């Protein structure tokens, strides 16, 4: 069982971290730790001026950090619990 969270904000994700982990722990699913993973990030470089000034740039960087969730036991009571999870949509859970 493999569950991957990947979001934009560390405050939302760490708040949403134990929402999966502790609730699945209630039915005893033998869930692994919230393992982090390297952040697929990207750099956009854009000229700051309208018209001139190629040598005066205005860089913008987009960070998508992600943390991993694995479950050992099936425990179909958790499958109903994982289905009914209600989160802010920035995290985009995928199983």
């Amino acid at each position: 069982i493999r569950i991957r969270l990947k979001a934009y904000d560390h405050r939302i994700l760490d708040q949403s971290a134990e929402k999966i982990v502790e609730t699945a722990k209630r039915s005893g699913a033998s869930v692994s730790g919230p393992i982090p993973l390297p952040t697929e990030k990207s750099v956009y470089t854009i000229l700051r001026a309208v018209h001139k000034y190629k040598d005066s740039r205005e860089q913008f960087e987009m960070r998508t950090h992600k943390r991993l969730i694995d479950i050992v036991n099936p425990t179909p009571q958790t499958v109903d619990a994982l289905m009914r999870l209600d989160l802010p949509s920035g995290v985009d859970i995928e199983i």
């Binding site: 470089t45 040598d55 005066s56 740039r57 860089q59």
Partner: protein, 125 residues
């Protein structure tokens, strides 16, 4: 049996000191097998030579990443910290000779508008 880690110019070294005779093995390779230029061979040996630790400890090396002088440069910190674990007595002798710093001279990032991270391109009038 003492253990250490080594980092210098973006490369990772793992140093562990089994009681041996001074043989240094680099991920099942040897020194001249992997690193030429015997200037750095006496330079990687520099923490071993000040304290009397000449022919008494064999070294397992895990060179990871980087380039050769940065790779061997990570070991000459990692040999020290592994050999710091043996006795903290001669740490004061080593620290006066440097060798504990983990040199913070990382390669600086290129600025936008500048060629080589401090170089202004050219100029006219």
């Amino acid at each position: 049996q003492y253990y250490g880690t080594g980092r210098r110019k973006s490369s990772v070294a793992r140093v562990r000191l089994v009681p041996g005779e001074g043989r240094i093995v680099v991920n099942n390779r040897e020194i001249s097998e992997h690193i030429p230029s015997a200037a750095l061979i006496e330079d990687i040996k520099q923490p071993l030579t000040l304290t009397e630790t000449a022919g008494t400890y064999d070294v397992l090396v895990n060179v990871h990443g980087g380039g050769l002088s940065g790779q061997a440069g990570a070991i000459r910190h990692g040999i020290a910290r592994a050999l710091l674990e043996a006795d903290p007595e001669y740490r004061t002798t080593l620290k006066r000779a440097g060798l504990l710093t983990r040199d913070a001279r990382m390669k600086e990032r290129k600025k936008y508008g500048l060629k080589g991270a401090r170089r202004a391109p050219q100029f006219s009038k």
